[PDB]
């Protein structure tokens, strides 16, 4: 039987790989993951359904759409009940592991062994990490509770290490899950990457300054009514919270307080990457000097996306390209096919019934995601789609961006901004909490963007209103509201957005 280590990093996205030829590729940022691809298989059109941590990391645990498990936004939490893709491998004999950042709200309880951040609600620390472990048993969860000295990334490290090393039971097959916190914000990075790429500009998307034909009144306001309200920035642009002000530049000239708001943040977040990939150079050392390199199925991906300034926006929760789509590389040893890539399209939803599958199990039936095991074995699935969904249900909340649906197909890309919060009681609060002007949570405006993510992939150009595309319009409109229903999603729970979303849709 393959073992298998599933390891995910929170918010490391698609433009910060190598392998995944960005802008940022020439900077060499993950030679270590670079060469796992080079043994592997790595993904090009695979997208989160719902980019913030929790319901990413609860769609990836359940196999199931946010709709189906209810994890909609970072406000709600996953139950142990819900833990299917560890029940899956328990059930296949497997002894099970959680290292790392778990953010899920409850218990690892389903896992043989679990040893997880705690700081901060679930978000751990960058030094000096606390963990909550099973094997501290005087007391009960949330409080078995550890300390360990150091750099989380150097830790987490060293807990996967020791369960394999000192724990595991060496009879029987395991499944890891091996989850870092960086490159998370702060982007606190470890004292020894300090200078990393001090004497280099990082490349800057000419995104950042020029935003003319992106975006919608959904996103904009009419006539750039909202331009300061909708969407955190890495400029001065929004005014509640954007880096210029979080990192003090000010120059004098907003367009260079803005460049150099731009390498702080880049430069900081490459350095939390490297740091990962430094990492895991010492675990996959590890691997191969133990005997597992090849009967063990190695698994790299993030969370979701993140905006590393595109558009100027940041964080993620957008469907743009660089938030919905997420790293995804497989190294699975009895695949033939090294140094591959596939372009099918595929969700963080299929990650459980593919991994089940490979191992030899049954795709599980009570999961929206399917298997696309069969690519290892150079065969498309059967009948397998070639669009995807994706919802983000969080209204506003922490980073100002409106709650919106849309389909991506191979070419197309159509954004239903509906701007409104499943719950009503929430209109008014503050979006963010923490700030005594934060703006509140409204209602925002109705509108589409449509983007030709083939010639068009760094979605410059909204052309929702250009008549030449009325007839692949109506046709996208035609698919998201088909696609809406084909998965469920249909807001019988939510009478006030299913009305404007139905109305939307024609
Ligand atoms: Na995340």
Not at 446 to 459: A, G, I, Q, R, T
């Amino acid at each position: 039987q393959m073992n298998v280590i599933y390891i995910m990093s929170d918010d490391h996205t698609s433009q910060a790989i190598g392998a995944y030829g960005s802008r940022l590729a020439v900077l060499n940022p993950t030679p270590t993951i670079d060469e796992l691809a080079r043994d592997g298989m790595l993904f090009e059109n695979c997208f989160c359904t719902n980019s913030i941590s929790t319901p990413s990391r609860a769609c990836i645990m359940t196999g199931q759409y946010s709709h189906r498990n209810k994890v909609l936004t970072l406000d709600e939490v996953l139950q142990p009940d819900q833990e299917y893709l560890v029940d899956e491998f328990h059930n296949m004999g497997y002894q099970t592991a959680m290292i790392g950042k778990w953010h899920l709200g409850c218990e690892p309880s389903h896992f043989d062994y679990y040893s997880v951040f705690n700081g901060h609600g679930g978000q751990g620390e960058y030094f000096d990490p606390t963990f909550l472990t099973s094997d501290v048993t005087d007391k009960k969860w949330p409080n078995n509770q550890i300390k360990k000295m150091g750099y989380s990334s150097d830790i987490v490290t060293n807990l996967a290490i020791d369960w394999l090393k000192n724990r595991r039971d060496k009879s029987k097959p395991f499944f890891m899950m091996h989850h870092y916190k960086a490159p998370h914000d702060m982007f606190e990075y470890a004292p020894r990457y300090e200078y990393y790429l001090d004497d280099v500009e990082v490349p800057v998307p000419l995104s950042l300054f020029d935003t003319d034909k992106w975006g919608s009144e959904g996103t904009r306001g009419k006539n750039d009514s909202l331009r300061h309200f909708i969407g955190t920035s890495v400029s001065s642009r929004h005014e509640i919270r954007n880096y210029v002000m979080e990192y003090k530049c000010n120059t004098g000239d907003e367009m260079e307080n803005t460049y150099l708001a731009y390498q702080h943040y880049l430069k900081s977040y490459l350095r939390c990457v490297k740091g990962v990939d430094d990492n895991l150079k010492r675990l996959f050392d590890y691997l191969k000097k133990e005997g597992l390199w090849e009967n063990t199925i190695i698994v790299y991906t993030g969370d979701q996306g993140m905006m590393l300034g595109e558009h100027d926006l940041q964080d993620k929760r957008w469907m743009y390209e660089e938030s919905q789509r997420m790293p995804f590389i497989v190294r699975d040893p009895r695949c033939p096919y090294k140094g591959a890539k596939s372009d099918l399209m595929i969700n963080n939803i299929d990650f459980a019934p593919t991994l089940i599958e490979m191992v030899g199990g049954k795709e599980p039936s009570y999961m929206d995601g399917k298997s696309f095991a069969s690519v290892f074995e150079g065969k498309k699935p059967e009948n397998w789609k070639d669009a995807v969904y994706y919802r983000y249900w969080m209204h506003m909340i922490h980073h100002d961006v409106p709650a919106h649906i849309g389909i991506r197909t191979e070419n197309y890309k159509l954004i239903l901004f509906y701007g409104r919060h499943y719950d009503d009681k929430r209109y008014g609060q503050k979006s963010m909490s923490w700030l005594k002007n934060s703006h509140k949570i409204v209602p925002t405006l109705v509108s589409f963007e449509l983007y030709d993510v083939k010639n068009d992939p760094y979605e410059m150009v909204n052309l929702a209103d250009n008549p030449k595309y009325a007839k692949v319009l109506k046709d996208m409109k035609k698919k998201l509201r088909e696609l809406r229903k084909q998965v469920g999603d249909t807001d019988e729970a939510y009478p006030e957005l299913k009305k404007v979303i139905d109305k939307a849709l024609r």
